[PDB]
């Protein structure tokens, strides 16, 4: 998963986030900040149209956010290679989630929203 993580970090940095991959278990794949916003990211790349993220993976994203007094947004960021698009889902609670192209949004749509939330 390292190449996809590097690509995502590069995207986030291009978008003005300070983003870093955390070397590899208890921590998110990537975290990124811009202003008072902290993204806690599970990053996945797939040729399938869906990806399963386990409860404990989501929990790790949330626990990481709980460490900081920033406005946290947990994110499952998936490069859905079969549509050549990074899409994201913001987990609302720690549970098993199947992220699909249909229940995710383009990462650029997220960035558009975050631009408003930071503004």
């Amino acid at each position: 998963g390292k190449n996809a993580e590097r690509e995502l970090v590069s995207i986030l940095r291009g978008e003005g986030f300070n983003a870093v991959r955390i070397p590899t278990n208890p921590l998110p794949d990537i975290f990124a900040t811009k202003g008072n916003t902290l993204l806690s990211i599970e990053c996945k790349s797939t040729w399938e149209n869906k990806v399963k993220v386990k409860e404990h993976q989501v929990r790790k994203l949330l626990d990481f956010l709980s460490m900081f007094t920033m406005k946290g947004v947990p994110l499952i960021a998936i490069k859905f290679k079969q549509v050549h698009e990074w899409r994201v889902l913001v987990p609302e609670k720690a549970e098993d989630i199947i992220v699909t192209i249909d229940n995710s949004i383009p990462i650029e749509d997220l960035f558009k929203i975050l631009e408003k939330r930071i503004e």
Side-chain angles (χ1 to χ4, degrees), residues 45-52 78-85 87 98-101:
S45 196
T46 186
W47 282 100
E48 308 198 350
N49 64 12
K50 59 176 28 187
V51 287
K52 184 172 188 65
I78 309 297
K79 186 178 185 182
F80 280 108
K81 289 184 274 191
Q82 81 162 233
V83 292
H84 200 43
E85 194 178 38
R87 302 180 71 91
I98 300 167
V99 187
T100 69
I101 297 160

Side-chain angles (χ1 to χ4, degrees), residues 18-36:
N18 205 143
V20 297
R21 300 189 334 126
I22 298 170
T24 297
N25 175 357
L27 288 165
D29 295 338
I30 292 163
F31 73 91
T33 62
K34 190 178 182 172
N36 192 232

